[PDB]
Amino acid sequence: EGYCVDLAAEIAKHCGFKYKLTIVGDGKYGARDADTKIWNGMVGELVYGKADIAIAPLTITLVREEVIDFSKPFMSLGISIMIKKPQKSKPGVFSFLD
Amino acid sequence: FSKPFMSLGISIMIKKPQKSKPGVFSFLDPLAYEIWMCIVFAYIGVSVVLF
Amino acid sequence: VRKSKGKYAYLLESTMNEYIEQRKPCDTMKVGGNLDSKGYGIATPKGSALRGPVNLAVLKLSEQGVLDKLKSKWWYDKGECGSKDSGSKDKTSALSLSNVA
Amino acid sequence: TYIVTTILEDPYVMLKKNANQFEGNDRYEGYCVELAAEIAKHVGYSY
Numbered sequence: 457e458g459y460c461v462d463l464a465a466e467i468a469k470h471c472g473f474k475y476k477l478t479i480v481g482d483g484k485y486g487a488r489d490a491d492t493k494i495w496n497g498m499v500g501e502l503v504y505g506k507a508d509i510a511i512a513p514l515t516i517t518l519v520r521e522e523v524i525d526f527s528k529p530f531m532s533l534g535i536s537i538m539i540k541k542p543q544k545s546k547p548g549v550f551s552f553l554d
Numbered sequence: 555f556s557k558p559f560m561s562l563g564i565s566i567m568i569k570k571p572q573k574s575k576p577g578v579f580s581f582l583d584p585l586a587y588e589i590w591m592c593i594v595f596a597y598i599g600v601s602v603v604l605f
Numbered sequence: 606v607r608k609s610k611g612k613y614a615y616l617l618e619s620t621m622n623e624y625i626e627q628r629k630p631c632d633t634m635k636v637g638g639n640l641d642s643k644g645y646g647i648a649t650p651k652g653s654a655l656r657g658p659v660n661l662a663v664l665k666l667s668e669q670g671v672l673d674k675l676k677s678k679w680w681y682d683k684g685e686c687g688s689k690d691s692g693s694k695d696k697t698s699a700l701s702l703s704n705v706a
Numbered sequence: 707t708y709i710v711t712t713i714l715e716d717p718y719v720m721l722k723k724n725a726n727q728f729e730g731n732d733r734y735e736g737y738c739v740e741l742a743a744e745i746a747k748h749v750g751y752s753y
């Protein structure tokens with residue numbers, strides 16, 4: 457029970473069908489093999505007939521759209537910055553000139 | 555439709571606060587103009603009485 | 606909003622707010638994040654052969670960092686007031702000299 | 707050729723100055739105009 461679980465439960469409501477919350481045995485995403493040239497993860501499961509839909513945050517791109525028709529993104533990602541919270545530093549000497 | 559080439563959202567637009575350069579006599583703000591004048595008139599009044 | 610001077614907060618889209626702040630005399634600014642999430646997109650008649658290759662071209666341009674370059678050029682590199690003092694001057698906690706001038 | 711439509715009252719497609727000297731799509735300049743040129747170059751179709 458999470459975000460994608462509720463998303464799939466809401467999608468199956470507007471689109472009536474029978475679905476089973478299967479989990480991928482590899483735990484990876486769409487990655488083209490160097491020499492084998494075979495997909496893996498959810499893309500590898502959908503390209504070889506293992507699941508019907510992938511309710512998961514898959515980053516859409518050019519290498520994946522050529523083999524799996526994606527949909528409109530339900531959320532947008534972003535390369536953000538994280539830092540420690542700006543706590544009060546230790547007041548050094550000459551602090552009366554503030 | 556194609557894939558979204560640009561994301562957006564309902565944003566808020568407010569007036570940009572200016573620098574708000576304080577006046578030359580900004581240090582006379584904690585006391586009103588009536589207080590400063592009444593102090594001067596009380597200053598000369600006490601001096602004449604003391605003399 | 607410019608005449609209210611901190612009394613009217615207009616609610617508009619993100620792209621129009623960034624353009625009206627940069628490509629116009631910047632007396633107003635954008636504050637806060639987007640409330641909802643939308644997205645533009647080029648269209649194609651229903652059942653046309655100009656949807657596949659067109660969709661692949663859009664994803665290719667967005668992946669190669671081209672749309673970010675075009676946005677930064679038309680929204681920031683051509684603003685009216687420009688970016689005066691791009692380095693945001695931190696609010697000095699100390700007392701200024703003009704306050705006791 | 708292909709017929710392409712767009713809106714004018716927006717910062718995306720605008721009428722560049724000295725439009726009498728130019729003609730056709732060359733007069734229209736803007737961010738959305740550059741996007742149409744790049745897409746037509748990648749797909750490979752005149753418009």
Ligand SMILES: O=c1[nH]c2cc(C(F)(F)F)c(N3CCOCC3)cc2n(CP(=O)(O)O)c1=O
Binds near residue numbers: 485486513514515516
């Ligand atoms: O489709 C993809 N969707 C992804 C979604 C997530 C998140 F949703 F944040 F869990 C993450 N993480 C971010 C940091 O590392 C741990 C998990 C990775 C994703 N990756 C691998 P990437 O492309 O190397 O980023 C994809 O390929």
Ligand SMILES: CCCCCCCCCC
Binds near residue numbers: 586
């Ligand atoms: C506010 C204008 C008058 C200021 C008078 C300041 C007097 C200072 C010495 C009492």
Ligand SMILES: CCCCCCCCC
Binds near residue numbers: 548549550
């Ligand atoms: C916050 C510590 C400041 C130390 C300044 C030392 C100056 C020596 C001349």
Ligand SMILES: CCCCCCCC
Binds near residue numbers: 594
């Ligand atoms: C308008 C007030 C002038 C005060 C001059 C200084 C008086 C001691």
